[PDB]
Design a protein around this nucleic acid. Sequence first.
RNA 1: CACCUCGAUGUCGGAUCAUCGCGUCCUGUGGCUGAAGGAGGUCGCAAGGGUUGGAUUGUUCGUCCAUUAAAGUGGUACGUGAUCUGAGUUCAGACCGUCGUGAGACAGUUCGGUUUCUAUCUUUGUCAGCGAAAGGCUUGUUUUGAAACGCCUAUGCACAGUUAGCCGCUGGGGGCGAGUACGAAAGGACCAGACCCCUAUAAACCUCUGGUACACUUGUUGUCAUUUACACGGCAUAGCAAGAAAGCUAAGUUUUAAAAGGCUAGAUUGCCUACAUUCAAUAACACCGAAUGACCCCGACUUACAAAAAGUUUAGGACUAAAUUUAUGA
RNA 2: UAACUGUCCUAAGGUAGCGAAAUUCCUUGACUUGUAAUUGGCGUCCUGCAUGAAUGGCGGAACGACUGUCGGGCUGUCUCUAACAUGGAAUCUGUGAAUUUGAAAUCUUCGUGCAGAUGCGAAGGCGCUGGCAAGGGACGAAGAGACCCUAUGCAGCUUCGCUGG
RNA 3: UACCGUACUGCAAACCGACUCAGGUGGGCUAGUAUAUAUACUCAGGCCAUAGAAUCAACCAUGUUAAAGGAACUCGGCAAAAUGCACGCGUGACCUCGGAGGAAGCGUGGCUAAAAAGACUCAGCAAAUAGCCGACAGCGACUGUUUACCAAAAACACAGGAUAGU
RNA 4: AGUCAUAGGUAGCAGAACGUUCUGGAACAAUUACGCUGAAAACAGUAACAGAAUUGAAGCUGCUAACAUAAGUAACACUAAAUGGAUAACAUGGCCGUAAGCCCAAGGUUUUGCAUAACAAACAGUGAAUACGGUU
RNA 5: ACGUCUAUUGGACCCGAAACCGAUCGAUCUAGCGACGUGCAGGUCUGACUUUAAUCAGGACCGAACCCGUGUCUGUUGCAAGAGACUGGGAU
Lengths: 304, 50, 71, 177
Amino acid sequence: GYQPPKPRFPLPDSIASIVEEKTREHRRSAPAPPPAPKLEPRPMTPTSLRTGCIATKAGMTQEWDEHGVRVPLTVLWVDECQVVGLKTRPVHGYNALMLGSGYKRQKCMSPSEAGFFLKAGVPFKKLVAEWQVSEDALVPVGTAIGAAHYVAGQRVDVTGWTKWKGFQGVMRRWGFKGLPASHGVSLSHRAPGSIGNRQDPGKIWKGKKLPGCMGDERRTVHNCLVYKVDAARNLVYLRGQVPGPVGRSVFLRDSRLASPALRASWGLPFPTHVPSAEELKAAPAPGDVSVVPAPDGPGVTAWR
Amino acid sequence: GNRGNTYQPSRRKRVNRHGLEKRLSTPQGREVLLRRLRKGRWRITVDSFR
Amino acid sequence: ATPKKKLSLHRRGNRRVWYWLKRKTEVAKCSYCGALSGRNQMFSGAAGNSACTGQCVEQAPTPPASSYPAE
Amino acid sequence: ARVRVRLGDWNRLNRKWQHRVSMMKTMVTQLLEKERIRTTLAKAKTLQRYADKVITLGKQGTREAWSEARGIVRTDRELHKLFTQVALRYRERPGGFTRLVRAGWRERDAAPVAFVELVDRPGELRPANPALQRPNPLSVQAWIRQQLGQPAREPSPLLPPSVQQYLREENRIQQGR
RNA sequence: CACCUCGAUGUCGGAUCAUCGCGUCCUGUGGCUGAAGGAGGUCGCAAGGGUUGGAUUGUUCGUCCAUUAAAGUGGUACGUGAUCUGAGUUCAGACCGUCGUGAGACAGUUCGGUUUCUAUCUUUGUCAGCGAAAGGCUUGUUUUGAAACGCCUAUGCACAGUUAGCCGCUGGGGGCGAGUACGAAAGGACCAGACCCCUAUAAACCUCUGGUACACUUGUUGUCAUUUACACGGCAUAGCAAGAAAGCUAAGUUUUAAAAGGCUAGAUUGCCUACAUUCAAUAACACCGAAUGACCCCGACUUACAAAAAGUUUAGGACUAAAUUUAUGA
RNA sequence: UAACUGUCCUAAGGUAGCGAAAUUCCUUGACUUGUAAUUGGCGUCCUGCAUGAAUGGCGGAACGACUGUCGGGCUGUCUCUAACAUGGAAUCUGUGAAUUUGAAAUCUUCGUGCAGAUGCGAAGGCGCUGGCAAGGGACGAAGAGACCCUAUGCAGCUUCGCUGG
RNA sequence: UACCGUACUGCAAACCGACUCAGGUGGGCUAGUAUAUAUACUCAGGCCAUAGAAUCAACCAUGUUAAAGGAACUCGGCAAAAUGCACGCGUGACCUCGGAGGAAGCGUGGCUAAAAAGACUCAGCAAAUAGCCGACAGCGACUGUUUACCAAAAACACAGGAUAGU
RNA sequence: AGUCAUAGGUAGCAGAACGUUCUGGAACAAUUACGCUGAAAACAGUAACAGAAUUGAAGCUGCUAACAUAAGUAACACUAAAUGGAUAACAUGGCCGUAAGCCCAAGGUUUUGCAUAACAAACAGUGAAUACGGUU
RNA sequence: ACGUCUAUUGGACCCGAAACCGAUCGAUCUAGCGACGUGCAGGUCUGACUUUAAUCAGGACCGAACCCGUGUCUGUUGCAAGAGACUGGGAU
Ligand SMILES: [Mg+2]
Ligand SMILES: [Mg+2]
Ligand SMILES: [Mg+2]
Ligand SMILES: [Mg+2]
Ligand SMILES: [Mg+2]
Ligand SMILES: [Mg+2]
Ligand SMILES: [Mg+2]
Ligand SMILES: [Mg+2]
Ligand SMILES: [Mg+2]
Ligand SMILES: [Mg+2]
Ligand SMILES: [Mg+2]
Ligand SMILES: [Mg+2]
Ligand SMILES: [Mg+2]
Ligand SMILES: [Mg+2]
Ligand SMILES: [Mg+2]
Ligand SMILES: [Mg+2]
Ligand SMILES: [Mg+2]
Ligand SMILES: [Mg+2]
Ligand SMILES: [Mg+2]
Ligand SMILES: [Mg+2]
Ligand SMILES: [Mg+2]
Ligand SMILES: [Mg+2]
Ligand SMILES: [Mg+2]
Ligand SMILES: [Mg+2]
Ligand SMILES: [Mg+2]
Ligand SMILES: [Mg+2]
Ligand SMILES: [Mg+2]
Ligand SMILES: [Mg+2]
Ligand SMILES: [Mg+2]
Ligand SMILES: [Mg+2]
Ligand SMILES: [Mg+2]
Ligand SMILES: [Mg+2]
Ligand SMILES: [Mg+2]
Ligand SMILES: [Mg+2]
Ligand SMILES: [Mg+2]
Ligand SMILES: [Zn+2]
């Protein structure tokens, strides 16, 4: 799936001396890369973009609010999400944070990709992604991005890859109506119907809806609420559905759809949840459950 | 109704129609036999044997 | 639902690409009897191998057991 | 069209379900009469699952188990073998009474072929592993099995010495009534 | 008119699915208003997406039932039979009426009356294969210009422009604003700016509610087997009937702002101990999985506070090794 | 309205009993019912384009794989489709056709043109080749006769067409 | 007490259809539950050879089930669904007095009881077989016949009647 | 042998030639041909002069034969159901059972039996003796 | 006279009809007739005869064997140059 790449004529007629000296004096005169960011808590600039998260769908459950209404709650789990790489405006063309999640053994990963983690000094992640971030949002390599990055009542934009269903016809892929079951219709109860329009168009359109293998598609659900965050167990409880099956990782970000630059007064820590007293925290061991926050909302039964 | 099976075999009817004696019974049947002889057919009638 | 012209030798060869078989990159060879098969399959005398001399299995000692033969 | 492989369930084997259960009953009866049978991979995997179910039912040794096996297992010469030789042979084995070895393809239809046989018998093709593995009381596993509620589960003879002091008694025979 | 096809080529309908124009019915809007804001008449811009019911006619014509913000008009061989119908326009049977001496004619009414085709390549949807390299290192080094080592990039792989191209593209109604500015007065708004409800469309999901569930559980009829007409087994649509869990699904549940969102190619940057076999013949389970320092699969045991998908376990398969464990606290 | 009288060519101007009917142009015939809404039926009425005792007029029991309409029950026909079962289809192995075919290495739009272009002109696009699907185009394929016209054309039939024993 | 037939096949891979063709092909014999040669299972007997192997495509064919509705679909309830059985009650108009008519509509059914009765099941015509019903018209009195290969009808015939000839 | 003039063509008309088979002139290939070119074309490279023609073919939905394409595509779905290392004798399971069982007729006319490949059709097989059917 | 080109009569440059006139063969398909023989499970209703009783009638009714092909669907170089499934009509 690539064009024929390069004719690559080698002979430069001896102008190669000028280009080699120009390249040597171009790399050596480029600026030194900026220092390690070393982030502590920072101010909330209104036009500043935060990082995202790689969370794992764990299924759906039932909860009732204090007002007494059932809410469909999916539960996501943050699998040791850390910052693996970094891109910034001086050395790269853009300013981004590269995130990693999960874990894989050394024998289970390709040697070209394992070398990247061994150079970075981070464990071998199973998924690597990146998010565009502002200049003041560059968090250093090795920093965890857990459930505490998000707050209860926040609206997020979850991105997921849909369940695979295989090849289906236009009845359930495009939702087309077919022909009647019993009025003389011959062998065409699930036919797509007319596809072109005769000699004057003379062809089928480039965007025609025809049967195909739907499934595994990157669909984003926009502006979904966060109902509960368990910081100790890395659990976030979104309300509503998340695309994808259970066990597949999904992407999260602050909802840019609801963006007045105020972030709707959500209590978002800007660089990440910079943890104070990181000591006195147990490793995977005999730990217990912790406390969580939740939004309330007003008048779900204001009248009948 | 499927066609194609007009030939219903019967030895009595075959010998009684196209046999030697009905050919010899009438004059024009005898000239039928005579031109079968003039053509040179190895089988003169449907019921000839030896 | 019907070809309008006759297919050329070049176009026929291009269309017949799905019909060709891929070569296998591994084979399990018995050093004695020279038999050839996959690494996940038995190809000794119990399976089809008229050339088997039993040297394919190099050790099989199991004398002791005790049970009730139902007769 | 219902999903059987990919959603753990029984194979369809190109047959209606009543034909499918009857064919599996015939094959499990044949598997215990001659202890190694050869068939296609799909029947071989289905036979392995069915053999585990039937062998455990014979291992129960109860009257209801005999009644259920009487319909499941056809021969009756081999209903005795399942309840006596097979039950005593695998009395302490936690499943996995059968192994599968692939044997290539068959001539009539190029279908993959597997050898399916009972393990732990004279005439098997790989040495079995012991069903139990007596624990060292001076190792980590034994202490984990003391702090947590696990039994000893040691290898045992058919009649251990814990019944010897009952059976030795001449006043516990009842004369045979 | 008869220029094109009689080596015969679907129109005079709707069923599904479309694309485009604006001479705009609505939604978004500006001017003139005989302009009380309402409610109207024009006129100017704007084609994003919306235009529903069915009762009657073979009718694309038309009403009139009553709902909406509205129930748009056209190019589409008055779009669309190698997707569907043949209800009407081409016959063959018959009757009634008209004309005819009669064979017969009727674009007068009726009843009945064969819709063939396995996709070559042009499009289109989707899923895949092929598109090799090592170049010189005068090797930075070594003697016994060949051997690997060190370099620039070359492929591969990963993240992939404040980076190309392309697709989708953001629907409304009623309240609250307001018993209101207005207005003798009845009569009631522009602003949608935001909140509450609904309804579409689009994208998902199975948490709820249901449907289905054919090796699940219960009850039962006939009959064949049954040295017990105890239990169990076969067949009768799974024999029948009832109730089920996973999975799928909608009638269910969420989300649908300026730009959001997706698809394909990709300057760069980074990395490289990468010949690609097995775990089931349709991996779609599984590459964001495993192959013995392995719970990947399968089996076994337990769970009614899972009417069953989790937990333990290396029993079996993904073979494999020894001089401190046939081996992970899997 | 024309019942009785007045007229003209004329075999004679159609009775009790029929009629927008198998057959009535106006047509959605005014009239009642039928439905919320009826041009297709039912029962009246009259204005019979182009009805009517041997082309038999007037209705009836029973009968009809005949035709047009109304109620009850019933249900996926439908609102609006979903799951499952069996057998094809899709994968592999074995056997193994035909329709079609000037040669092809066959892009899009606009224009031109035997007047609807893959092949011409202008501009643009396109790594290459397939599997599985959908059928808008190739005026797809299948019949040198669907319909109209013509022939020193045939054939059969009809008659107060012509000629014949 | 001679002559001819005597193999094999004969609802079929051996006959008639170009075929190992889903078509057409005459007569006879037969066991039980049981009762009819129908229906479900089975006896004697026969068969499971003429493509096989797994699997979750879409789609097609044939079916099962489906919440709330129910002809709203459609030229037209076309196609499906529904009634479908033996013992009792009952039972319209119209009519050629025969019929309509099984009108319509409602009870009673398996199993145990040498027996006045009962058990429990959601379900007792328990599985398979065995009419949808009523009303208004049109046409043809009726049963029949008709275009083998798109029309089974109001077309043809029919008993009867009239006329003409002999 | 140097100058001038002419040379687009359908229907049509006129002129010059090439090639195929056979014959006459006594016999022009017994022992082959093969320097790979020549010519304006038809063509030539095994005479020439005359003559006799079933004398020249991409072109008639022509006829015959062979070979492709579609394409290793469609098809190998009416049914009872198969399993065990075999279209198994044995075992297990299933299907018909007013037939898918048995006995005949019409019709067919040897399609009927024998070998764990094989050298086997070349070999076998139809018996009227119960008052069997026919012939009368 | 020979040679060439036209013209007339011939099939007369070649191939192609629908046709017309005679006299062969075909009722083994199908239509009618004729002779001989055979078949119509199970029930239901009505009328008649005889009854100590093993009889007849109805172009009667429901329904197998058998005959036919109404509607729908499948199939359309099909299983079949007219078939299959389910509904159907007749069945003294
Ligand atoms: Mg059809
Ligand atoms: Mg028939
Ligand atoms: Mg013939
Ligand atoms: Mg299927
Ligand atoms: Mg069954
Ligand atoms: Mg669930
Ligand atoms: Mg279950
Ligand atoms: Mg049985
Ligand atoms: Mg599905
Ligand atoms: Mg193991
Ligand atoms: Mg299948
Ligand atoms: Mg054009
Ligand atoms: Mg493609
Ligand atoms: Mg294709
Ligand atoms: Mg003329
Ligand atoms: Mg038959
Ligand atoms: Mg045939
Ligand atoms: Mg046959
Ligand atoms: Mg049976
Ligand atoms: Mg078979
Ligand atoms: Mg219901
Ligand atoms: Mg019943
Ligand atoms: Mg009758
Ligand atoms: Mg009749
Ligand atoms: Mg010239
Ligand atoms: Mg000139
Ligand atoms: Mg000579
Ligand atoms: Mg010639
Ligand atoms: Mg193949
Ligand atoms: Mg066998
Ligand atoms: Mg015979
Ligand atoms: Mg002359
Ligand atoms: Mg004759
Ligand atoms: Mg019948
Ligand atoms: Mg009937
Ligand atoms: Zn070997």
